[PDB]
């Protein structure tokens, strides 16, 4: 027994029209792609905003009214019920002025927005949504105060409901202040995107954040909204996927992260790309390479990002050590980030990430770990992020004492408790 959002990853769908295409309506069309979303083993969808919003007009913004373009209240109830049968929960983004520049309207209108929000929360909770997301909270007067109020409003009406806050900030102290204002609040940020992307820096960022948030259940993301491939260098995409799935807490992705999908170029209007189901909804990729960069294309491809995402997401869903296990960093070679996931006597998971573009010895040091956690002579390789090695050594025994990693390679190894 744990909260539903502990049990796997969250999957952000900002533009329901872009995720579906021109074929169907946003809400109705989203229902038909639930089978696919089940293969990813995502526990929650963070949809929208879907509400009526006249750009920068507070009185022509209704958080309870769905944009008729996307569908009807009836279409949305179908989605909630369809998802519930698949054990998938629905989070609704209620960022009010999402069509305009100032996401929360003018700072002086915070009080009017908050009353509109209070009313919205009750109505959607009744309708049967399981949580809410609030982005650009850096642009909200007294964000700590209002997030707290909205948590109280949500908790007063039910216990098992999730609130997600978003920010553009990559600053540790700013992020902690928002986290501490409200209990059981996930917070997405640019913390893990503001980096040299060196092993020591990645290790530093992760260990410093866990030291600041202590016992609280953390979330792990690279932004509050955008695609992972827009913030993380291409050569680290597989390494970051592994990192995000295996750190203690709830990993948060946007649609296309499983494909390595990129958003608008620095010379385009910043708006979400089409989910490339097949080649009839891809852009900037010609034949024959286009065959490799769709959902249908990566589906059967053993070495694709979609296969790694499904494999790691599946493990994250069913392994007790990955579900709610403690974390212990290991001493290793410079720019290798190694750590252990462990729960009671359940299978230990050893993660070793090489952030250097060269062969490197892990030189794992486990001397300061708690009693009952000791590295064995050898351990089972579940997944290497190096497709070459994965196709040769998946589910094989590797000697840990002389363990070496390929350039930008990530290893997930498994070993049992010894009685």
């Amino acid at each position: 027994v744990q909260r539903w959002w502990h049990k796997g990853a969250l999957y952000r769908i900002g533009d329901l029209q872009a995720f579906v295409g021109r074929d169907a309506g946003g809400i109705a069309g989203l229902k038909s792609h639930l089978e696919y979303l089940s293969t990813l083993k995502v526990k929650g969808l963070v949809l929208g905003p879907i509400h009526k919003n006249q750009k920068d007009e507070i009185n022509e913004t209704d958080l309870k009214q769905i944009n008729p373009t996307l569908g009807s209240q009836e279409d949305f109830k179908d989605l909630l019920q369809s998802a519930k049968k698949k054990s998938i929960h629905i989070i609704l983004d209620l960022t009010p002025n999402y069509q305009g520049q100032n996401a929360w309207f003018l700072p002086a209108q915070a009080d009017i927005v908050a009353t509109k929000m209070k009313e919205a929360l009750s109505s959607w909770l009744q309708d049967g949504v399981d949580g809410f997301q609030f982005r650009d909270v850096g642009k909200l007067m007294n964000a700590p105060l209002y997030l707290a109020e909205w948590q109280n409003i949500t908790k007063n009406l039910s216990e098992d409901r999730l609130l997600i806050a978003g920010t553009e900030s990559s600053d540790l102290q700013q992020i902690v202040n928002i986290l501490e204002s409200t209990s059981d609040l996930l917070l997405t940020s640019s913390y893990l995107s503001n980096s040299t992307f060196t092993g020591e820096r990645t290790e530093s960022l992760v260990t410093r954040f866990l030291n600041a948030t202590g016992s609280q259940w953390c979330s792990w993301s690279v932004s509050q909204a955008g695609l992972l491939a827009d913030f993380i260098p291409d050569h680290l995409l597989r390494l970051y996927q592994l990192l995000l799935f295996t750190l203690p807490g709830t990993p948060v992705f946007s649609y296309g992260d499983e494909l390595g999908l990129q958003g608008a170029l620095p010379g385009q209007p910043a708006k979400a790309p089409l989910m490339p189901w097949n080649e009839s909804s891809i852009f900037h990729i010609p034949r024959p390479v286009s065959l490799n960069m769709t959902v249908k294309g990566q589906n059967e491809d053993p070495g694709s990002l979609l296969t790694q995402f499904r494999r790691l997401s599946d493990l994250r869903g069913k392994e007790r050590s990955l579900l709610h296990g403690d974390f212990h960093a290991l001493s290793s070679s410079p720019d290798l980030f190694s750590y252990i996931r462990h729960w009671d006597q359940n299978e230990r998971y050893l993660v070793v990430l090489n952030f250097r573009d060269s062969g490197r010895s892990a030189r794992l040091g486990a001397s300061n770990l708690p009693a009952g956690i000791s590295l064995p002579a050898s351990a089972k390789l579940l997944l290497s992020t190096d497709s070459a090695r994965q196709s040769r050594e998946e589910d094989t025994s590797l000697k840990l004492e002389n363990l070496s990693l390929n350039p930008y390679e990530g290893l997930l190894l498994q070993f049992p408790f010894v009685a």
Binding site: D234, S280, R287, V289, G297, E300, G303, S387
Partner: protein, 174 residues
Amino acid sequence: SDLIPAPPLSKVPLQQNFQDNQFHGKWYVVGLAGNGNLREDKDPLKMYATIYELKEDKSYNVTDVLFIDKKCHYLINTFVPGSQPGEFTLGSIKSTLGSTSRLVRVVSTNYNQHAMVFFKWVHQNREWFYITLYGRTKELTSELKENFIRFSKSLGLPENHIVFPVPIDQCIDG
């Protein structure tokens, strides 16, 4: 790195004195080889057509003509010129080392019958490489098809990673 490794570009010939005007217009894909996917669906890949439309800035508006889910679909992309003529890049170039990451290179052509074009595409410390055998008709002789296999095999591709897309008629016949 790669399951089926990529060749260096030093081992990929470049068509000498490339006439970008003579190369323009419609090509049928008679042969395809590479270390990536060679099928769109569950059956062998069906023939497609690529149109190289030469712009004034001497880049190509490249249009792939595709028969997918019983309708015609069109991939429109821009082949921007590289160092030499006959070489091209794709998308926004970041580095000078990674300026070769998304690249197209015309190996050989007589312009009015056959052509062979090499594709390089890096994806997370791995390289997709393809060889496209182009024809102005859907048919080419056993010698030209044999030259394609020999050249495909010479860059480290097995026979089961070399296919001749099944000729079709819908969409690709203009």
